[PDB]
Amino acid sequence: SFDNYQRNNFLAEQPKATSTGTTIVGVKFNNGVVIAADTAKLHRISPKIWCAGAGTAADTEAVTQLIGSNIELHSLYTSREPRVVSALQMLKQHLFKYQGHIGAYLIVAGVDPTGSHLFSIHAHGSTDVGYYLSLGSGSLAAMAVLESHWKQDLTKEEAIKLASDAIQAGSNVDVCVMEIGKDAEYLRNYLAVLKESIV
Amino acid sequence: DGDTVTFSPTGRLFQVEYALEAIKQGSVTVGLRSNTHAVLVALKRNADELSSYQKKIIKCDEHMGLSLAGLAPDARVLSNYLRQQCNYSSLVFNRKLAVERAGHLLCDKAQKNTQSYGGRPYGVGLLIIGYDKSGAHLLEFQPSGNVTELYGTAIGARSQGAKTYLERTLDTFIKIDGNPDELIKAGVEAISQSLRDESLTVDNLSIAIVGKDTPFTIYDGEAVAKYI
Amino acid sequence: MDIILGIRVQDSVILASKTRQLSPHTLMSFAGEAGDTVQFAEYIQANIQLYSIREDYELSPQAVSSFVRQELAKSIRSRRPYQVNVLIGGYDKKKNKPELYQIDYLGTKVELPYGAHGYSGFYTFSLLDHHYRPDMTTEEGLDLLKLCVQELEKRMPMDFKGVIVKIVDKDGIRQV
Amino acid sequence: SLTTFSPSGKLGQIDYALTAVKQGVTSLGIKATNGVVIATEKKSSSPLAMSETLSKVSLLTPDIGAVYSGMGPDYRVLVDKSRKVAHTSYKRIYGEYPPTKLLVSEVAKIMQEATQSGGVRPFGVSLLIAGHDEFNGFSLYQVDPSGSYFPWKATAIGKGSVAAKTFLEKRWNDELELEDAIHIALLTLKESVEGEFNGDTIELAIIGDENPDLLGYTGIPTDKGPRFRKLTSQEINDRLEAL
Amino acid sequence: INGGIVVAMTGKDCVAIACDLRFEKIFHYGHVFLGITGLATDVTTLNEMFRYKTNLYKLKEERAIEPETFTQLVSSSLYERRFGPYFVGPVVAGINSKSGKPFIAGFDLIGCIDEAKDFIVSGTASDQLFGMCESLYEPNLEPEDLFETISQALLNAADRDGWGAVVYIIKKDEVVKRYL
Amino acid sequence: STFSPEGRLFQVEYSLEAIKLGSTAIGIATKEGVVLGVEKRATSPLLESDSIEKIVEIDRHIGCAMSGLTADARSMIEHARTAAVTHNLYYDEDINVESLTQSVCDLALRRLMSRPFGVALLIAGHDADDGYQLFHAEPSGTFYRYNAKAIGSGSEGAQAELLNEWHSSLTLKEAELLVLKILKQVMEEKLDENNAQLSCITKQDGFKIYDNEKTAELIKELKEKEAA
Amino acid sequence: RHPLESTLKNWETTQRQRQMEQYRQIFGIAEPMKRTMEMEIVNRTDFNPLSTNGSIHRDILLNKECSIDWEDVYP
Amino acid sequence: VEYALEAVKRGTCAVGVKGKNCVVLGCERRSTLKLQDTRITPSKVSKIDSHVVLSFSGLNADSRILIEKARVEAQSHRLTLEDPVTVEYLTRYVAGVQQRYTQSGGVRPFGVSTLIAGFDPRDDEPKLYQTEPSGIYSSWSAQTIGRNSKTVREFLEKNYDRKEPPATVEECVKLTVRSLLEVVQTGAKNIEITVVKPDSDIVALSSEEINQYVTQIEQEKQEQQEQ
Amino acid sequence: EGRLYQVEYALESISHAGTAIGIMASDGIVLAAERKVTSTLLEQDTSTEKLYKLNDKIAVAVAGLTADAEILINTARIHAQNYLKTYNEDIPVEILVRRLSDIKQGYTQHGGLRPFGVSFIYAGYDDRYGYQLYTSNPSGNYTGWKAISVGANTSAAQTLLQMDYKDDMKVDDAIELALKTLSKTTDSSALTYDRLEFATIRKGANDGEVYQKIFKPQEIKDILVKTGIT
8 A cells, every 4th residue: 555655765865675585495296295495484375375485575474364364265255175276366366466566476385175286476476387396596406406306206205305405405494295185284494871760 | 197217007108298298388380391401480489579589490500400399498408419419520520410310319318318217308399400411301309209200290289280281282392492482481381370360470480491502591580571 | 045943941932034823822934945835834824723713722832743743744645745844832821831843844853942944054053052051031042043143144155134033922922 | 214213212124123133043152161152053944955055153263153043144244244354454454363342343333334324224133253362251242233232141042032041041150161051052952943953953163272183284383273163963963962 | 863773682571672862762552662763754653653553452452452463563554555664673572461471573664573582673773783782692681681781782882972872671560761 | 307287397386486476676678778676675674785685796797686585596696607707707708698698597407307596587788799688587497688577576467567668769767767667566665775776787887786875866756757 | 656556546446347348248238237237326325424434235246245455454 | 494494493592783893692591501511511602713703593413513614614715815704705605505405305404593793804894694594694783583582673673773883882782681681581691692893802791791781781671660 | 393303213212221420520520321121141341331431531421322332432532543643632522522423413414314322421631621521412412511411311310410419529429429310310120230330530640641440340349338228
């Protein structure tokens, strides 16, 4: 919402916002999907849909908890679990509505009654999908790492070891893993004047 | 009932039957058409011998004409509307309204006030005349939006005589073209036939005439001494 | 130029000139350019008078001191701000304090024993900085105005024509 | 009538909306020292018609549940607006789901806004809302068509309400734990019931201490997840063995 | 004076917050506290706005605001100005009135919860005081030793002109304000 | 807004029957100017002039007088004044009077079937297109041109002598003593500068309202003419 | 000035106006007129000076019954 | 409109007179209801601006909103011109709002009549205007509204000539207390009066000062009995 | 006729709503409302029934539909806090009751709405006129008072106020007369401490601010043990 505008341009002629410039991964695996970030960057849209975020941190926390409100209301209005493509549609519509002026770069990964999925939203509302992605500025090393050492159907353990390697490329990590029958798993940091009165 | 959109137990519309009762209250007017020109005669009203007699001929940029057979203000709403409807068609396109859509536009616009909940229809019979890309035209309009191109007709209280005369003499006007002469006089005889014991005079009577290379010129002025 | 200058003394609020009464115990002054600097003063004067019609009573100098900056900030939140200084002061007929407040162009607020504006206006401020006494008398307050005028046209490039001076006190607004 | 006053200051149209509430298939709720219960009878039609789609009881926030008597469509829109309010006025400013007091104030406003606005009849439902606030605790409210809301220790609304509150005024006392409230509530709807008494003619749901097993993820001990539980027909048919 | 310093520090059942000379930029709301480095316009606009919101909350919810809930209130209310964000570094503080936990948090201008629980620094200055504060601190002090090191941290943060400071000590069921 | 069994609006007719018991305003046109005059009734001798002025200026060329609640038409008269002077401010001409009379009496149509200004009205004035012109206006939409016309309780009874007692070549003073002779006809009263008020409307005077002193030399002139 | 100003202020109704244009081209003159006439007897009949929220049945005709905008948390 | 003027005929008697250099307004006011407080009680007579007053009879609830609407207009007129609104222009607006709320179904008319009065700068004519539910503005040199106003209007029209405005505030106040004393069988503590002199000298009269007028008229009336 | 029939019936509506009293002191104000006959299962501290707090320095004792009153109470809070944000200074009680009493005429002005069925006894303090006590009713008129009642049996309560009220008395004297009044105008066979609500306003702890307590049901017992029965 637009208030206090046309005045800051004169006052600047400004505190910097807390951008996360770090690096994050998602890898699709034998029974689910993994995501991780080089830490708190692992926001929840819902218990089974998770976002690793990058860029302006306040934007990522605000929009994920707004879409997570839409999706919590949605699960209560249908009596069904939400889908990764529901979150992807709503982030596309919602980040298109705010035209990349909200600055979040944002993975979406999750499990739902249809299957396991992995997508990413860039600032323009543009979307990518695949068996793996990496985002936040360290990712050019993780391109090579994931393309080289991923294979058809890594299980939990190798996907967590590959995540460790991908984020290590480009000293500590947050990781969360969504497994198709089970509660999603969250792992943190895995790798001499005086006067007085009562007031 | 008096309700403006509601239908009677027999399927009737009492609001439009009473919009047509304004024909049983407005003072007579009559009109007719030929190969090249068309004519209407309006007979007027007054409050006292002193009073100035009522205006009932108008035009739309010397391209169309109009008369009233009931409430002049309601016919004036349709007059100003159609006159601006012919003003935007002229200036925006460099074209003209050929008279075909004038009948349609009235018949759209008058049906709507019986259609919506809102203010009542224009409570008056109207006669519109003009000249096209081909030929002169007469349109009778009737409330709730009927258009009919009647070859001759008369409207207002007890006007059955002037209809009977335009029917009774299909010569003298249908065949008449080039110069306007007998159109004016024959129409004037039909209205002059209709009055029971009342009078015809040089201010009291006025004629609309339209057609090929007559820019619509209003005839209530002293030139009407040529046609009484 | 046109510096607005104002000093508080134990007796009164003193203003020196772009100046207005708002109400029977409030003066204000409004150094700044043509248009909104002048024109905003009408809206405050109108609505505060609407209050002192509508109540059989007057707002404090505090009430107006904040209300002016709420509206000044508000009127500019959808604009660029403009070169303005608003100096408010009045006599509080509950506390018997004379009071003075400076509002800068962005809509600051600062409660003071004196206020100012303008470049060479800092000379006046430095003279007040030398001279002030905790409870200055009226005659010394008027002499501090004499003292700042006595430097101002000497330190200025030219005779910019000094001041016109006014008081708020318990006896209502007075002019000199 | 459009809810304008009658010749002794009665609202007219609201007394008939209370009679729509009065005609509904019963619901009741109890405050218990460690939790709160919400209870209602379902009906549907033949064994052709399920009673097990969108339930009669429903979750408003992770810690508040609701149940009703009267016109179902009115209740169903009130709860689905009520869910939207909790997120757009509380959760997206404060980061906390609204305590029972505030979300009941908001449902009460939608009902009052109907006993005064243009072109609208009152809503024909009374809403029992029950849930847990960390600061003032386990709580029960009734919201009526009039928009007025009363907090209670226990209450019942609709067809069975007179018997059910006569029973709960004879029964409820300041020592009851959650489970014996359920054993009175079951015996109460065992006397609201027009049909057979069983684990699909009765809905029954609870607020107690949380279940991190229902958070659908773990790893942040901070979060406690759901305060409210929808009992399954099996969880109900266990307790229906004792009654 | 054109840009404030606020410093914040933690100990067993206690917290300290410190502030500039003049108009102290430590505002208070019964039992939550808000330092604000920023432009004086926005600093008083945030007090006007949070007096309004915190009185509405204090009236509506039948309890005053707690530090964590105030943290999220200032976060979402700065995000309400995402396109025109106030020029501020709020530094909220308090003891949570139910649990007795210390709480401190900082923010950027658009409401990020900068949850730096060790100590919190906020200004246009910062760089020297962050280096002093991490060096002078030790964990789990009592109120007076907590006061001695935060007062040393400000007395070393003082550029060499001298001008004093205000130090709040905020504690489980007590608050005191020292004009240092 | 509503129709009758006979073609006419009840919201107009059941309003207009009020002005039939309203103040008896009368006007006369002549070769030399127009006269306009009224029963100067007051609720008490305590009422000052310059309040409910039952006759008013519109511009130096035009006045008004009326018979129902003047404050209703006073709203229409605000617009009549402002619309007239804005024509002149834009185009440097007085709006030719009949075009003002339509534009000021068109307010009773607001764009349909309207609740009435329950007051009939007498615009009168000068232009070079049709001369000194005396009109009439209504909660409908109507006209007159130049003769005598009247409104209010005595008016149609007065109209029977107004039609008789007039001709084109009259000078203004003839209409002045003629407007006093008629204004006495039904009031049960001695007219004077307290029970009657007058105006003369000319190229030399503009619109002007007779001063109480000039109302005592014209009533003296009629009173000494009573011996004729 | 700001590139998103006015564009977002009118987004609520402007998207609804364009959605009525799709209703025209896919279902003819009947459905947008039917809905915009429902819009006029639902929005204009909400007379209640103390209630500025708008109308509860508007979202039952507007698809906002189960969704949030920043504009709905930041009124 | 007809039932609405019976609201005025149900409202308190309000009255006034012009003078050569003042206007006096007053009202029958029901004193105080045993437990009511005067300082916490609204006057009936009400200021609109330092040079303009409004008094009234009928719906006091509608009269708050009528005066509150007049107060925003009177200040807006002043703001928009620095023309401290002339009484004839203040009257136009207030009469206009009673026209506006007559004309429609929905927003039914203000159930109120007013005396509006004041002094333009340097206009020593006391402008007094009376308005009613329809939005007339009959001016008067003296007038009565409210209930029982028969004997008030009869007694006033027997004691004043429109060409006889008393200059002295003494006689100005003396006439009006006699007039109200015909109606107030409840005794002359119930009356309230207020005066405008030119150039913003609007002045209220105290409960003691009106008594030096009730016990000046009373012994004058006893001297008229002994005569 | 000069009458409004919905509005006379809205006044008949507040006449059903149970009795409520308010009495001023030479230094403070008191409020005292009856909760009518009530079921054993009602909660007794969570139930917002008759009294409320509208800012730091103003309260209300209401009779009506509580649902109607809640919206006016909320708008008084919003207006009071927006005034306090506008002028950096407290809202006078009279301005606040004017603003709420306008709304209650602005609906009565109209056919598209019913008027609010709520009366409102306001207590508050300001640095305009000190302690102020106001009363406001369904047509939107308002009046100041020293001692007043609203709702059911208003007249019988004002007959008990009329002769007993002495103009100089302190807050803790008025706490007697409120219960002498309510118990003589009782709508129940007898009182119990849970059936009534009270709130008070006083000059700070001592000087400076204002003190503005709501009595919880034990504090209501503490004022009933006094001026009680034997």
